[PDB]
Design a protein around this ligand. Structure first.
Ligand SMILES: COC(=O)c1c(O)cc(O)c(Cl)c1CCc1cccnc1Cc1ccccc1
Length: 217
C-alpha cells in the first residue's frame, strides 16, 4: 500500500514550495481550480452517459473548516479518481513535464496553473495531504502523503462521497489562519468568482449561532 514519488514529482514539489514561499494563499486557488476541472469532466461524461450522475446529482464545491482538529476540507462532486488514478496522477507525472523542468527553474504562479500541477502547492500550508476520492468505476479510496512517500488504501467507511473528491489539509503550525472563517470566505470569494459551479463555505449566522452552507460565487 506504500509508494514512493517519482523523482520528477519530488523535484517539482521542491520547486513549487521554494518559488511560492511569498504567496502561500495561492494553494486555495489551485484546489478550487482543480475542483472546477473535475466537475467539468463529469459534466462532459454526463453528455454521453445517462447514468453518470447517479452516485451524486449535485455539481458543487463545498469547503469546510475544522478548527479544533486543524483540518481544512475542499470537496467537489466531480468525476473522482479510481485507486489506479490516485496512484498514477498524484505520484507520477506526464508527458511535457521535462520541458517544464527548465521553464520553472529559469513569476511562477501562472506556470503551475498552466501545467496543471497546482495540487502540490497544498504542501506550502499543510504537513499532511489526504485525498478521499470515489469514482464511478471503483470503490472509495484514500490517498495520504507527508510528501516523503504516499499510501493508498480502500476507505473502510465505504462510499460516503457518492462521487467526487475531498482534499483534506492538515495545516502547518504557521498556517493556522487558514482555519478562520473570514479568511477562507474572503479567499474563496476571491478565487471562485469565475468558477462556473456553485462554491459553498460552511459558515455561521446569528441569538444562537447556526451553521449552514453559504454560497460564495
Ligand atoms: C479527477 O480529479 C480530481 O478528482 C481532483 C479533484 O476533484 C480536486 C482536486 O483538488 C484535485 Cl488536485 C484532483 C486531482 C487532479 C490532478 C492532480 C495532479 C495531477 N493530475 C491531476 C489530473 C486532473 C483531473 C481532473 C481535473 C484536473 C486535473
Amino acid at each position: 500500500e506504500k509508494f514512493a514519488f517519482q523523482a520528477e514529482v519530488n523535484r517539482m514539489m521542491k520547486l513549487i514550495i521554494n518559488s511560492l514561499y511569498k504567496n502561500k494563499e495561492i494553494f486555495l486557488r489551485e484546489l478550487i481550480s482543480n475542483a472546477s476541472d473535475a466537475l467539468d469532466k463529469i459534466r462532459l461524461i454526463s453528455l454521453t452517459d445517462e447514468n453518470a450522475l447517479a452516485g451524486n446529482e449535485e455539481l458543487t464545491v463545498k469547503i469546510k473548516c475544522d478548527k479544533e482538529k486543524n483540518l481544512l476540507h475542499v470537496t467537489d462532486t466531480g468525476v473522482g479518481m479510481t485507486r489506479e488514478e490516485l496512484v498514477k496522477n498524484l505520484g507520477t507525472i506526464a508527458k511535457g513535464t521535462s520541458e517544464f523542468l527548465n521553464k520553472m527553474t529559469e513569476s511562477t504562479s501562472e506556470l503551475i496553473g498552466q501545467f496543471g500541477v497546482g495540487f502540490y502547492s497544498a504542501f506550502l500550508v499543510a504537513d499532511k495531504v489526504i485525498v478521499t476520492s470515489k469514482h464511478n468505476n471503483d470503490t472509495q479510496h484514500i490517498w495520504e502523503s507527508d510528501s516523503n512517500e504516499f499510501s493508498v488504501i480502500a476507505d473502510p467507511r465505504g462510499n460516503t462521497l457518492g462521487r467526487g473528491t475531498t482534499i483534506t489539509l492538515v495545516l502547518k503550525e504557521e498556517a493556522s489562519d487558514y482555519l478562520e472563517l473570514d479568511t477562507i470566505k474572503n479567499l474563496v470569494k476571491k478565487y471562485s468568482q469565475f468558477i462556473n459551479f456553485p462554491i459553498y463555505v460552511w459558515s455561521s449566522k446569528t441569538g444562537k449561532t447556526v451553521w449552514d452552507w453559504e454560497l460564495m460565487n
